[PDB]
Write a protein that binds this ligand. Structure first.
Ligand SMILES: *[C@@H]1O[C@H](CO[C@H]2O[C@@H](C)[C@@H](O)[C@@H](O)[C@@H]2O)[C@@H](O[C@@H]2O[C@H](CO)[C@@H](O)[C@H](O)[C@H]2NC(C)=O)[C@H](O)[C@H]1NC(C)=O
Ligand SMILES: *[C@@H]1O[C@H](CO[C@H]2O[C@@H](C)[C@@H](O)[C@@H](O)[C@@H]2O)[C@@H](O)[C@H](O)[C@H]1NC(C)=O
Ligand SMILES: Nc1c2c(nc3cc(Cl)ccc13)C[C@@H]1CC(CC[NH3+])=C[C@H]2C1
Ligand SMILES: *[C@@H]1O[C@H](CO)[C@@H](O)[C@H](O)[C@H]1NC(C)=O
Ligand SMILES: *[C@@H]1O[C@H](CO)[C@@H](O)[C@H](O)[C@H]1NC(C)=O
Ligand SMILES: *[C@@H]1O[C@H](CO)[C@@H](O)[C@H](O)[C@H]1NC(C)=O
Ligand SMILES: *[C@@H]1O[C@H](CO)[C@@H](O)[C@H](O)[C@H]1NC(C)=O
Ligand SMILES: [Br-]
Ligand SMILES: [Cl-]
Ligand SMILES: [Cl-]
Ligand SMILES: [Cl-]
Ligand SMILES: [Cl-]
Length: 526
């Protein structure tokens, strides 16, 4: 089975899924390998090839530092790359239903990883289930991360910043030019991603170069107005110059620094990426999106506030316990192997870890707002409070503020609150409904009865898969057949959202009302 693209013929492989067939094209190149003189530059378009590219396996993952905090632990190694690391990594994957669809809606996945790590070949991003069940076309791409994808000396075309975002954008360009040959509809393309991938998706709503490359957007546990999402240009310059000094590349002529870094081998850059920031936190984004004046023409907060974004429908949501995952990466008294019951003192030292450059009054304000106990006696109180502090500040409240600002300019928005803890979650119970563990349900992994998800989890995954596909195809995330509850539009006034759980489903209003008033209105003033 062979498909002719604008740059050459590609050969896929047939897969058996749920008694049916899905055709997979793994590892299709979409740019020149950013090697040598092309390192740190924007991605270059492909040149023709006369042969047949055998797109039969996942391609290389981009260079990145691997999470080594828990060796042998599936809870952390599930996120580590499962293919070879290489600078030659800008490839994409396409899952098409069998037989070839006529005009199928396309879903483009942008993985997360704090803009430092990630790859499209992860088991939990396997798009064959969605292609099998909803007969949509799933596309995922690899984009450069870390310094190799986001180092910025702005205005300098040798290292202008946002290369990884331009990598994603060139992949969307590829879908627009080629997906029709796979039976796809280039006019029905929905981007979706998680965490830094969701922040990437939200930035594509702002980028002028991305306006006509997709139709709708889904933002899972992330948005560009999150505190970790966008680095200022003065911060980007210091961290670029800091990396230069650590590698012996400090030159006067800024163009010379880049060429020096272009001749350091990738691992010297990787080992030094960690030390470019002096005030580290578990949510530190060493090299990330900047206002480059090309992909991003202005400060994203300004464009969001004044309505300069693509007018379309969005699907946004968060998980119940977004913050717990980061506590075991620095917070004192916390561990994945005990119940992490902390004292008031350890809670306060935890605030210093996550809010290092915040005044003493600002941290007393955080403490005051998160210690109005329902029950004074619960030993879990400070443990769960710091989890809620990290989760609301870094994910939930930014996501809610984005959805409210976006809907204020007339577009339909839908907000969800995912609150089911996976029965196969390798992390301890106290970490709850963790950041990143709605992804398996979105991609339909519980529909595979071979894994021992509950039957309730298969039903929940089946319903979420239908809502996601219905949003991509029709702009409305309803599940109309099985007498579900209707998902109402999120409006700036009432602010309704939908809970996703195995037990029931409810329409609620004003999620984290008191908490997000503090983080979004008051806390920026301290
Ligand atoms: C939950 O575990 C943390 C960390 O536990 C690590 O430290 C070992 C001493 C051992 O307990 C093992 O479980 C693990 O490798 C506990 O915090 C630690 O407490 C000790 C003193 O008791 C300090 O010296 C450590 O620096 C400190 N580590 C961290 C990361 O804070 C914590 O006490 C424990 N909680 C409960 C309720 O048991
Ligand atoms: C600008 O850079 C200054 C130098 O960074 C060094 O700081 C050390 C503490 C260590 O991290 C070295 O690896 C760095 O090279 C730093 O002191 C300033 O604070 C920076 N200013 C800002 C605003 O970030
Ligand atoms: N800096 C980050 C990292 C990751 N995600 C992040 C998510 C956010 Cl919102 C912010 C920063 C992140 C995923 C990887 C894991 C870790 C742990 C390293 N032991 C640091 C990197 C790499
Ligand atoms: C591609 O795969 C086919 C089938 O496995 C194989 O016969 C062929 O030699 C491979 N290489 C090509 C076509 O260059
Ligand atoms: C796919 O749908 C679009 C409208 O969304 C239409 O313009 C186009 O002709 C269709 N292509 C087909 C049916 O091949
Ligand atoms: C830096 O060097 C490049 C090439 O070596 C040159 O084109 C550029 O003008 C130099 N910059 C300055 C400020 O001289
Ligand atoms: C609706 O329920 C039936 C059986 O109860 C199930 O087979 C089907 O997959 C469900 N559909 C959705 C969209 O959940
Ligand atoms: Br992440
Ligand atoms: Cl940061
Ligand atoms: Cl809650
Ligand atoms: Cl107390
Ligand atoms: Cl329901």
């Amino acid at each position: 089975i062979i498909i002719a693209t604008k740059n050459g013929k590609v050969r896929g492989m047939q897969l058996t899924v749920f008694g049916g067939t899905v055709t997979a094209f793994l590892g299709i190149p979409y740019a020149q390998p950013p090697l040598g003189r092309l390192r740190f530059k924007k991605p270059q378009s492909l040149t023709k090839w006369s042969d047949i590219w055998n797109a039969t396996k996942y391609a290389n993952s981009c260079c990145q530092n691997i999470d080594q905090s828990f060796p042998g632990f599936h809870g952390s190694e599930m996120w580590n790359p499962n293919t070879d690391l290489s600078e030659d990594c800008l490839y994409l994957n396409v899952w098409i239903p069998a037989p070839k669809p006529k005009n199928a809606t396309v879903l483009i996945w942008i993985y997360g990883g704090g803009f430092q790590t990630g790859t499209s070949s992860l088991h939990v991003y396997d798009g064959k289930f969605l292609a099998r069940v909803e007969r949509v076309i799933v596309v995922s791409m690899n984009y450069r991360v870390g310094a190799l994808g986001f180092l910025a000396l702005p205005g300098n075309p040798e290292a202008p910043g946002n290369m990884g975002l331009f990598d994603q954008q060139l992949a969307l360009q590829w879908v627009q030019k080629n997906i029709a040959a796979f039976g796809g509809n280039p006019k029905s393309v929905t981007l979706f991603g998680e965490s830094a991938g969701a922040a990437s998706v939200s930035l594509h709503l702002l980028s002028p170069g991305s306006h006509s490359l997709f139709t709708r957007a889904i933002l899972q546990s992330g948005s560009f107005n999150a505190p970790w999402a966008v680095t200022s240009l003065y911060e980007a310059r210091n961290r670029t110059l800091n990396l230069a000094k650590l590698t012996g590349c400090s030159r006067e002529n800024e163009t010379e620094i880049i060429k020096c870094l272009r001749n350091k081998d990738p691992q010297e850059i990787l080992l030094n990426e960690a030390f470019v920031v002096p005030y580290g936190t578990p949510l530190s984004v060493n090299f990330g999106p900047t206002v480059d004046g090309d992909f991003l023409t202005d400060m994203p907060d300004i464009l969001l506030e004044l309505g300069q974004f693509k007018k379309t429908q969005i699907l946004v949501g968060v998980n119940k316990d977004e913050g717990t995952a980061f506590l075991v990466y620095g917070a004192p008294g916390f561990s994945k192997d005990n119940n992490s019951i902390i004292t008031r003192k350890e809670f306060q030292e935890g605030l210093k870890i996550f809010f290092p450059g915040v005044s003493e009054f600002g941290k007393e304000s955080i403490l005051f707002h998160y210690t109005d106990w329902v029950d004074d006696q619960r030993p879990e109180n400070y443990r769960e409070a710091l989890g809620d502090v990290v989760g609301d500040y870094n994910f939930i409240c930014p996501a809610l503020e984005f959805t409210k600002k976006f809907s204020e300019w007339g577009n339909n928005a839908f907000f969800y609150y995912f609150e089911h803890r996976s029965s196969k979650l390798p992390w301890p119970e106290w970490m709850g409904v963790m950041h990143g563990y709605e992804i398996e349900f979105v991609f339909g992994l519980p529909l595979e009865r071979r894994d021992q998800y509950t039957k309730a989890e298969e039903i929940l995954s089946r319903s979420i898969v239908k809502r996601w596909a219905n949003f991509a195809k029709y702009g409305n995330p309803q599940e109309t057949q099985n007498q579900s509850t209707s998902w109402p539009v999120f409006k700036s006034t009432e602010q309704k959202y939908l809970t996703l759980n195995t037990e029931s489903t409810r329409i609620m209003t004003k999620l984290r009302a008191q908490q997000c008033r503090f983080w979004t209105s008051f806390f920026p003033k301290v």
